[PDB]
Amino acid sequence: LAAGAVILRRFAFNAAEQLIRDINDVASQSPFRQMVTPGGYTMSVAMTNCGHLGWTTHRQGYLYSPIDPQTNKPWPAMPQSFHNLCQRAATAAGYPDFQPDACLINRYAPGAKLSLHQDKDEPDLRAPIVSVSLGLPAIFQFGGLKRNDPLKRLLLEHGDVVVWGGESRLFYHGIQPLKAGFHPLTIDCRYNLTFRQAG
Ligand SMILES: O=C(O)CCC(=O)C(=O)O
Numbered sequence: 001l002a003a004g005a006v007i008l009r010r011f012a013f014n015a016a017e018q019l020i021r022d023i024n025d026v027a028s029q030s031p032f033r034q035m036v037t038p039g040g041y042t043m044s045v046a047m048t049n050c051g052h053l054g055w056t057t058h059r060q061g062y063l064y065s066p067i068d069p070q071t072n073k074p075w076p077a078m079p080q081s082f083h084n085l086c087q088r089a090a091t092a093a094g095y096p097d098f099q100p101d102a103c104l105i106n107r108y109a110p111g112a113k114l115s116l117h118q119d120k121d122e123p124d125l126r127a128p129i130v131s132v133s134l135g136l137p138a139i140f141q142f143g144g145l146k147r148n149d150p151l152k153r154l155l156l157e158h159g160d161v162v163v164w165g166g167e168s169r170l171f172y173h174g175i176q177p178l179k180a181g182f183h184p185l186t187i188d189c190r191y192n193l194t195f196r197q198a199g
């Protein structure tokens with residue numbers, strides 16, 4: 001559907017329960033927080049990070065920081081389940097040398113959305129982003145290299161993994177307002193993990 005993207009549906013289905021337990025452990029150290037955009041709007045999506053570097057708004061802009069500005073401590077270490085899952089998915093997609101040093105964790109409550117954006121804050125744009133979906137289904141939308149490219153829509157469900165490589169690495173993308181529902185593991189939300197090579 002997208003040049004350079006590898007969709008691995010249900011790839012993390014068996015690992016989901018451990019991933020969610022580790023999400024909670026990470027969040028007990030660096031809690032979920034709704035960040036303020038450089039434009040002054042509070043994001044409806046709640047976020048936190050783990051790894052060497054964490055994506056965060058700071059000084060009226062986006063940056064990767066080794067410190068959590070809400071705790072003044074380093075981000076929690078990347079759990080084993082995260083590292084193992086990401087390496088397995090990257091290798092299967094043909095990126096065996098991908099070594100993420102940052103994982104952004106998004107939490108979507110009903111009604112939460114992520115507006116169209118690009119992920120180009122990383123110094124090496126040749127490296128892929130590995131995306132892991134957990135919990136309630138979400139409508140993922142993506143266009144192309146331009147704001148104005150026509151959008152394609154794809155449902156992402158519990159356990160789906162996408163490796164955004166090549167051209168797709170630079171596409172505009174976002175998430176439509178999450179529909180309320182029930183999931184036996186996450187109850188009433190969706191989690192998304194995006195593994196990044198940000199160093
Ligand atoms: O929630 C998703 O599936 C996409 C998340 C995303 O694009 C991001 O956090 O950069």
Ligand SMILES: [Fe+3]
Nearest residue numbers: 117118119173
């Ligand atoms: Fe993104």
